[PDB]
Amino acid sequence: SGFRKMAFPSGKVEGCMVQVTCGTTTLNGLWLDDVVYCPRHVICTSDMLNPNYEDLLIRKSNHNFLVQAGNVQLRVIGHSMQNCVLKLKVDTANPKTPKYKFVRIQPGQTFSVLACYNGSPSGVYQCAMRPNFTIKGSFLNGSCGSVGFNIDYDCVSFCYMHHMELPTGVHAGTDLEGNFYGPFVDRQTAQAAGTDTTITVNVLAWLYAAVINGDRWFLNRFTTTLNDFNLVAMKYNYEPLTQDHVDILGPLSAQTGIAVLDMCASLKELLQNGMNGRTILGSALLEDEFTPFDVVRQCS
Amino acid sequence: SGFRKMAFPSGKVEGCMVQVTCGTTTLNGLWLDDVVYCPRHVICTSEDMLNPNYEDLLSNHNFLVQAGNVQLRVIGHSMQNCVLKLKVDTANPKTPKYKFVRIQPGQTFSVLACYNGSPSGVYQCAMRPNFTIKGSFLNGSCGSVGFNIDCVSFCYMHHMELPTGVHAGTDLEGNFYGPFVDRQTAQAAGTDTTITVNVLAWLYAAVINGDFLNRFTTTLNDFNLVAMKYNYEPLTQDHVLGPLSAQTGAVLDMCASLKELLQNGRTILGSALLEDEFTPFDVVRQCSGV
Numbered sequence: 015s016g017f018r019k020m021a022f023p024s025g026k027v028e029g030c031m032v033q034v035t036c037g038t039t040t041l042n043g044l045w046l047d048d049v050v051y052c053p054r055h056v057i058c059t060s061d062m063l064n065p066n067y068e069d070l071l072i073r074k075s076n077h078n079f080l081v082q083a084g085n086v087q088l089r090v091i092g093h094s095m096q097n098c099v100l101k102l103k104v105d106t107a108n109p110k111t112p113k114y115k116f117v118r119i120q121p122g123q124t125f126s127v128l129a130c131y132n133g134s135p136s137g138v139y140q141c142a143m144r145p146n147f148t149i150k151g152s153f154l155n156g157s158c159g160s161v162g163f164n165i166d167y168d169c170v171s172f173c174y175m176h177h178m179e180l181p182t183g184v185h186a187g188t189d190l191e192g193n194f195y196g197p198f199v200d201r202q203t204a205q206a207a208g209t210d211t212t213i214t215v216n217v218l219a220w221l222y223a224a225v226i227n228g229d230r231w232f233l234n235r236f237t238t239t240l241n242d243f244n245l246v247a248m249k250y251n252y253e254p255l256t257q258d259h260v261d262i263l264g265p266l267s268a269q270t271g272i273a274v275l276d277m278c279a280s281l282k283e284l285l286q287n288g289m290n291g292r293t294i295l296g297s298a299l300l301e302d303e304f305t306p307f308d309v310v311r312q313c314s
Numbered sequence: 315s316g317f318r319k320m321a322f323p324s325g326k327v328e329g330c331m332v333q334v335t336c337g338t339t340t341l342n343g344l345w346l347d348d349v350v351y352c353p354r355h356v357i358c359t360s361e362d363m364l365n366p367n368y369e370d371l372l373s374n375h376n377f378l379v380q381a382g383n384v385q386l387r388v389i390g391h392s393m394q395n396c397v398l399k400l401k402v403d404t405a406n407p408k409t410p411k412y413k414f415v416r417i418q419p420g421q422t423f424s425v426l427a428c429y430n431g432s433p434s435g436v437y438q439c440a441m442r443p444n445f446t447i448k449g450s451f452l453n454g455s456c457g458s459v460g461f462n463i464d465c466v467s468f469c470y471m472h473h474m475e476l477p478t479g480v481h482a483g484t485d486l487e488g489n490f491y492g493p494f495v496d497r498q499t500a501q502a503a504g505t506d507t508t509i510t511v512n513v514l515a516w517l518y519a520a521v522i523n524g525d526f527l528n529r530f531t532t533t534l535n536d537f538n539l540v541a542m543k544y545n546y547e548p549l550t551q552d553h554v555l556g557p558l559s560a561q562t563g564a565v566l567d568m569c570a571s572l573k574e575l576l577q578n579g580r581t582i583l584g585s586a587l588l589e590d591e592f593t594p595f596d597v598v599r600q601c602s603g604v
């Protein structure tokens with residue numbers, strides 16, 4: 015029993031976090047082999063409104079960049095820009111380097127965040143990419159260059175680098191290839207984010223997790239087509255559910271014997287009725303930061 | 315900005331996890347220097363687990379210790395309270411600076427759940443006032459540890475799941491938290507209560523995050539009255555936590571607000587019910603970047 019928003023063991027990322035300085039500007043970098051990855055606005059100053067990143071990089075030498083892995087000063091022997099990520103060639107290969115990959119993730123995916131300051135981790139926590147491509151993280155100034163990731167066996171899938179906090183208090187960033195998620199740019203101009211919606215297929219996976227752990231108070235005797243569920247779920251700002259979603263919910267239907275569409279009916283009623291004083295897996299709201307894969311890993 | 319339930323980095327602790335096998339019983343152990351700590355109920359058979367006599371049940375060779383794909387040679391075994399100690403040939407080189415502490419209820423900590431010696435994930439808990447923790451554990455997770463980092467301060471080692479889905483365990487000296495024993499029998503938690511000082515500290519984390527306050531200051535005596543009705547631990551003068559109101563300016567006003575929230579009853583920092591698993595030291599710790 016039990017159900018908590020658990021992150022992966024951060025150990026394999028902790029061994030990669032270094033500190034990157036360029037003039038007056040200090041933030042975190044990720045050290046994999048002989049390359050350190052960090053946000054490119056490390057070269058900016060307060061260049062915030064309309065930075066010309068190529069112009070600013072041209073005026074840098076290798077030794078403009080202080081790389082610092084704990085007590086050691088790494089030596090920068092090369093650098094280039096790939097989209098919004100900076101890539102620094104150091105002369106020593108990180109021996110703590112894990113087996114890893116870079117992966118772009120679609121909204122709804124979950125990942126762990128290791129929030130660092132100065133190359134020092136401060137905490138870990140679990141996060142979902144919102145449909146509007148943002149993340150409701152816990153980030154202070156100094157946070158940039160922190161990373162999101164999944165562990166799969168002993169291979170680390172890196173999927174997020176943190177670049178900025180938006181005026182609303184939510185956070186934006188890039189894959190490790192330097193391409194932003196969502197329609198954002200690393201510059202201090204007005205850039206609004208699309209409306210946020212509940213991640214429907216995660217709420218459904220959560221309902222199954224509640225049933226796996228012994229609770230069925232929310233079910234009912236109704237079912238629904240997939241279209242009538244979407245017509246209702248949208249009015250609560252719920253993402254559409256697709257046939258794809260319904261398929262990956264397959265294995266959870268099997269373990270419970272409750273058919274996905276039947277469980278959509280349950281969700282339908284919960285949006286209509288509320289909790290009525292009750293809780294589900296400890297919460298009094300419907301919870302959308304767990305994917306079907308997370309539910310399968312933690313519950314069984 | 316933002317507030318999440320955050321766990322300490324776990325790498326220092328991942329390096330100390332190992333598997334311990336006795337009979338068909340497998341579970342997790344804690345490898346520090348040349349000692350491996352785990353639960354004494356790893357010597358029991360299921361038939362033994364009904365009414366165990368540990369002293370009598372307790373040779374070396376019958377202890378398979380597995381660090382990764384390395385076998386630790388067991389050269390000595392002994393018991394301290396409800397914990398088993400296994401001396402091994404070789405000290406763990408990844409031994410961090412550490413120490414065994416014992417935490418009070420209302421204190422929070424991190425759990426690195428494990429299976430067959432392999433860290434599966436980490437999360438932030440609180441020691442419930444009824445001395446249980448609401449963690450997330452399957453069979454095979456016995457021996458996972460709770461801890462804080464400051465130096466790793468191990469405070470918890472997981473032993474059993476109670477019938478209600480909650481979990482009970484010991485400190486690393488083998489003393490149980492709460493009124494429980496390590497044998498399969500009839501045991502259930504005492505009625506539980508909400509950690510009042512932590513709800514206030516969480517209401518503070520929201521306020522300094524842009525989130526319900528109340529102009530109608532109450533007094534300490536008047537509040538506990540409200541609190542006892544609603545199953546809240548009484549608020550002491552120690553719980554008065556100065557550094558959080560001095561950083562956002564009112565203490566009995568926050569009590570005034572909580573006192574009102576309980577009666578009337580939207581959401582705060584994205585929870586619909588009042589959260590009591592953040593300590594005031596957590597709140598500063600998170601909103602400070604240490």
Ligand SMILES: O=c1[nH]cc(-c2cc(-c3cc(Cl)cc(OCc4cccc(F)c4)c3)c(=O)n(-c3cccnc3)c2)c(=O)[nH]1
Pocket residue numbers: 038039040041055062153154155156157158177178179180181185199200201202203204205315
């Ligand atoms: O030496 C350092 N220097 C800079 C930072 C830094 C920089 C940013 C940042 C970066 C860019 Cl490219 C643009 C930016 O405008 C955001 C904005 C503001 C107003 C309207 C708007 F549309 C967008 C901020 C930033 O967000 N953060 C930050 C703060 C809190 C939480 N996480 C990230 C930190 C740092 O840590 N170290």
